[PDB]
Amino acid sequence: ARQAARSHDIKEKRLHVPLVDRLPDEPPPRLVVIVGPPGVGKTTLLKSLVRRYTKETMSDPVGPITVVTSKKQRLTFIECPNELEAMIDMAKVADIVLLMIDGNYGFEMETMEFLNILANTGMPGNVFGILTHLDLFKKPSALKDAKKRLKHRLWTELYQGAHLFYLSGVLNGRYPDREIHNLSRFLSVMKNPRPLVWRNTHPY
Amino acid sequence: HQKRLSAPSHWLLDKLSGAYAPRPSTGPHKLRDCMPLIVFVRNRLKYALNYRETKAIMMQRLVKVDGKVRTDITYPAGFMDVITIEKTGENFRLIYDTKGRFTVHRITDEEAKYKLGKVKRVQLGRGGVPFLVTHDARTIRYPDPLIKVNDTVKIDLETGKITDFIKFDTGALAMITGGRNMGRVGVITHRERHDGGFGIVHLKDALDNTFATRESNVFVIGSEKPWISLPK
Amino acid sequence: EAARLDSELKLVGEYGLRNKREVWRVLLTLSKIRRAARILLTLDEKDPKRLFEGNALIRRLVRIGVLDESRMKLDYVLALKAEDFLERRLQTLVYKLGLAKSIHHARVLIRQRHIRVGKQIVNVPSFMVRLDSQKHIDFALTSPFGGGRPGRVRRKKAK
Amino acid sequence: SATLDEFIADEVSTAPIAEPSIGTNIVKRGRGLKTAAERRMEEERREYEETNFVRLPKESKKERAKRARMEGRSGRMNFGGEEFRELGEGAERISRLTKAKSSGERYQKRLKVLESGRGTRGK
RNA sequence: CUAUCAACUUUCGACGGCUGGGUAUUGGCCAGCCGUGGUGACAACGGGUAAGGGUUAGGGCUCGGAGAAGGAGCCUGAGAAACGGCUACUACAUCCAAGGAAGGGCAGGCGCGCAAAUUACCCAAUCCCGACACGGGGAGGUAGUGACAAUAAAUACUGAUACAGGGCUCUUUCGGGUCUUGUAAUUGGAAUGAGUACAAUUUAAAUCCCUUAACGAGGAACAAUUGGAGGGCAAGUCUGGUGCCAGCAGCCGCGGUAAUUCCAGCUCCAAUAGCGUAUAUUGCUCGUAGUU
RNA sequence: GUUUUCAUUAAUCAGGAACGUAAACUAUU
């Protein structure tokens, strides 16, 4: 009987509200935005992502950058500059978000501001926390304590059990290629975006 | 690559030699009836610590078994093989005890010069010459013509010459090398033929305890004459 | 129920434990020992099982100091009480030996590492002090009551 | 036979038992207390450490989980310094072991009384 | 385990003996020749698929068929019908200058549009393989996460002074009982571990553990939670009605946001680093088989 | 009732067989 209770509770977790999809068979590139406080290296993460993806050493990558990642779907990266106008625009347009956190320095008003703006306008498809500046630690006890309390505060911010990756060093001015490889492993195989009513009623 | 517990329980390893245990290499003695040289050095004697240390010691010509230098790490040395170490100048011999475990004994050169080996069998070799097979897998050409199966031979170990022999005899003292009563030094009192396989001897101790061991496991040491220095 | 509530509160206050969780823990081990004594009384007298097991149990209880050395019978092993276990607790033993002014003073002393049991210091106050170990409870050698440095606030006042 | 053995060593055999000093059987600032068995095990472990003076790795996940499942399955408890055991197959072993180890003058007096007569007929 | 399995084998020879072939060797294992069998109610044969041994006080411990896209054939080697290779067919897939060429496994993520344990480090020890002390090891250990549990226990300890006279309780209530209780009062003491951290140690390198110098407590903080019960309020709002009553309630009031210091932190209950909620729940007579 | 016999022949009922306008106060004791 308890198997029936578990099955019923899983199905009652499975249900939703039936919203309209409106996605074409030739899907546009999904929007990956990179949002963080000033001086955390969202441009450097953009450089290292596009190098893992298309093997091109961009010296100064600006504006949207389109990359093909599967034979079926393709992404495009946009770093947000440090102005709240760009933050609100890209927040209301985003689909998957890489939220950068400056490690030892802890959370920042830019991060919490963007998180609340995002959740108020519309909770996008995927959000991942990336945590940098972990070479700037002297005791690994302090390192793992900061990692644990930042993961907990971030979970309480968005939801229980979000993905939070950690990027340790700055090797070639690029990133650890293994670190960004598992990051790209997470953001490669993708699902259809969450069908929000504003993006599915207006053309952008 | 067996586990430490599945290794035979009479060459001892404590609870800290890891989950593994070495297997003996191929050689004269049998697999179950062997003590490998690394276990003899670093587990029983503790003249070293590590596998690499034992590798270095065995690599330089420093450990001699049965009068010959042995190079490799896991050379088997099962039973009554003298182990001369010259930098300490000691000689070690492997006997059992009453419980049935390997026991090491210290000896000088006079008793270390010779070995006592049980005769496995005897035949005629190529050329029409009688040859003699010990349990040490040693073959002696041109033996004494009285040395039958299950005899014992005192061996020179320097020229391999047959120095002496001891006869299988009721009324002789023996040592057991197998069976459920393994390692019980006592006197042979009776032999039972049972023609058709697995003849038995009845062997009592020096102190009134009778038991039945088989001839294959029986290992004649001497009538009284304990030609090797048993530990006191 | 009000009876269980006021009883647990009386135990807590007169021996200033932290919570009824600790109270229920002592009640649980008391119940297990009392049950073992009950089974041994279910056996009959002069049976070797009851004789040896009951003698062992009484010797353990005496050697940890709960049962008095006068009475050594299984009826009194049944009459053993959680009040007796809490009297054997370490915190109440500091307060009774008189190193502390109050039971909570004993609790905070044991927390911030001033007393020792024998040779090593003791950080926990739910320690069950044995009768052989009771006499050696004193201030540690690194505590400002025992010696060592004059301490933190004394340092800041001397500066 | 454990209670039997402790009984022989404590009330029978004429030899003092080695009691450790009071502040040495404390593991981690009073969190637990080393019983006699774990104490002897620690001493054997330290003797192995000094035998060939090689350091030992502090216990791994396998052996730790094994002793954890053994304490989860066992019927012992460490209330104070002494160990308490359940009352089953140990007591039955005590019973089995105890059963197995259990497996010419009155003529002269009468003549003297008969020869002597009464002194008081009946008051 | 079963007769809702009593006949089975000779339907790939079933039982022999003789003769050879092949195999490392014996052998109906196979080819000739002839003989007549062999198994079974003491349970053959069939059917069901739910596929233990040793080490003995105990538990523990140890040991235990078919295939590498699919048939078929071949090759080396002490040991393989290796799936390692090749050969042809079939089924796929890739590059191209359209003449041609090479190739097939496991691990990870999603599997709703909504979710939760690393893509970690080294052969350092035990062990294995080599021309060989030195080379190489996907067993092995080291590390990281966890409120699913389970274990231990911080968030404060103790004085002095001044002032107020009530604090509490009940069966029986315009009624009883008991006597030291408080304060957003004023000052004094000491103790320190979370944390910060020079080092040294640990170790393959690190961490953890043990050592350990120096810092590190006054509430407006080094900032305890989750539920339940209950009181007090306006120049406010709403609703009922034989004036002022009653009820629902009440962040919302005239102004004022650098303005206010207000019940200044309302009171009580329970668990307390845990706790709460939902749901499931805990006509009569004879007569056969059958029965006594 | 007998100054009558046979000595378990017995009991029970699956299955089965023979007989066929209404209701409306209610081991003993």
Ligand SMILES: Nc1nc2c(ncn2[C@@H]2O[C@H](COP(=O)(O)OP(=O)(O)OP(=O)(O)O)[C@@H](O)[C@H]2O)c(=O)[nH]1
């Ligand atoms: N050691 C260390 N340095 C980092 C790390 N991340 C970023 N940096 C340095 O910090 C700088 C941050 O630069 P960006 O990441 O480009 O800043 P941005 O927001 O992306 O672009 P800007 O608008 O120019 O600030 C980089 O140039 C790096 O040199 C890190 O994780 N570790």
Ligand SMILES: [Mg+2]
């Ligand atoms: Mg940028």
